[PDB]
Paper text:
During the site-specific DNA recombination reaction that excises phage λ from the chromosome, the bacterial DNA architectural protein Fis recruits multiple λ-encoded Xis proteins to the attR recombination site. Fis is a bacterial nucleoid protein that functions in transcription, replication, and recombination reactions. Xis is a winged-helix DNA binding protein, which is expressed at high levels shortly after prophage induction, but by itself, exhibits low binding specificity. To explore the structural basis for Fis recruitment of Xis to the X2 site within the λ prophage attR recombination site, X-ray crystal structures of three different Fis–Xis–DNA complexes were determined.
Xis was absent or was bound in an improper manner at the X1 site in our X-ray structures employing the FX1-2 sequence, even though Xis bound properly to the X2 sequence. This may be explained by the X1 sequence having an A–A (T–T) instead of a Y–R step at the 3–4 position of the Fis binding site. Thus, the native X1 sequence is incompatible with co-binding with Fis. Our three crystal structures of Fis and Xis bound to the F-X2 DNA segment reveal little (70 Å2 in the FX2 structure) or no (both FX1-2 structures) shared surface between the Xis and Fis proteins.
Residue numbers in the entry:
A (entry chain B): 9 to 15, 22 to 98
B (entry chain F): 1 to 51
C (entry chain A): 8 to 15, 22 to 98
D (entry chain E): 1 to 52
The structure:
DNA sequence: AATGTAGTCTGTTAAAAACACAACATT
DNA sequence: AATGTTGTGTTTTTAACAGACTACATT
């Protein structure tokens, strides 16, 4: 409910996800899909990390406290998406 | 009656690392929440570790 | 390139669509304390993914799990979370 | 070389349900018999299906 | 009849969390 | 000199994981 992308109206991010997948599922020509959770997750993690790090003016400690994840976890998540 | 982080920690059943204690404050794990009174924290004598 | 795109008319990624909802959220937040955001974002992304994949596999939990690349137990647990038991 | 149940199954001409493949191991229907190394089984990359 | 699945279990382990500590910066 | 940060180790706890299985469904 608190997360909305200015579509001009205020449609949730929940709806925005459903549409990208409807387009993906259509684009897929019956190919086997071994890992989708990660496809979606990596696409949502990379921007989330970039938004908070910007918001906390680079403070890893604060960024971690904000997201509700361990500092080690944030560090690991950043290193994944080459933000180390 | 108020105490320093050092004082409070040293009174606890299992005194922990000061870095860990200052971390608990930051993580809202100490009740009543200690506040920086100027340059440093004031834990109230009744302070306790919370979830 | 990025297989996940929402028809904005152009094809802008979901990665961009996430950045915008958060920019709006951060602005909407009137200095309230934010203890857990990862979950806020995650639950908002999981609930639709599940509903979509489940629809695509015509209700098959087994297949849905294999597709997402998560353990069957995990999918079951994820569904029960968002009341899709 | 050894493979996981998942890996082996996915290589087979007609990959079957993981639960079906497990039931088979339990039934001594995979040769050489895959072994439980901790949390999971290990199949010979060229392991075969047999009649019960 | 052979194989596939929902549901309800077990145990194993990789991952996250929590705690360390040594630098050095900020207060 | 107390407190905060980053970088890097450990130890502890959580959660995903593979599998066991039975009744029923699909093939």
């Amino acid at each position: 409910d608190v997360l909305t992308v200015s579509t001009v109206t205020q449609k949730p991010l929940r709806d925005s996800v459903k549409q990208a997948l409807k387009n993906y599922f259509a684009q897929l020509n019956g190919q086997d899909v071994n890992d989708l959770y990660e496809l979606v997750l990596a696409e949502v993690e990379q921007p989330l990390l970039d938004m908070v790090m910007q918001y906390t003016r680079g403070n890893q400690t604060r960024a971690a406290l904000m997201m509700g994840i361990n500092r080690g976890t944030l560090r690991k998540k950043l290193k994944k998406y080459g933000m180390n | 009656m108020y105490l320093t982080l050092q004082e409070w920690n040293a009174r606890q059943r299992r005194p922990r690392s000061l870095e860990t204690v200052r971390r608990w404050v930051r993580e809202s794990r100490i009740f009543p929440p200690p506040v920086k009174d100027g340059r440093e924290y004031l834990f109230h004598e009744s302070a306790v570790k919370v979830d």
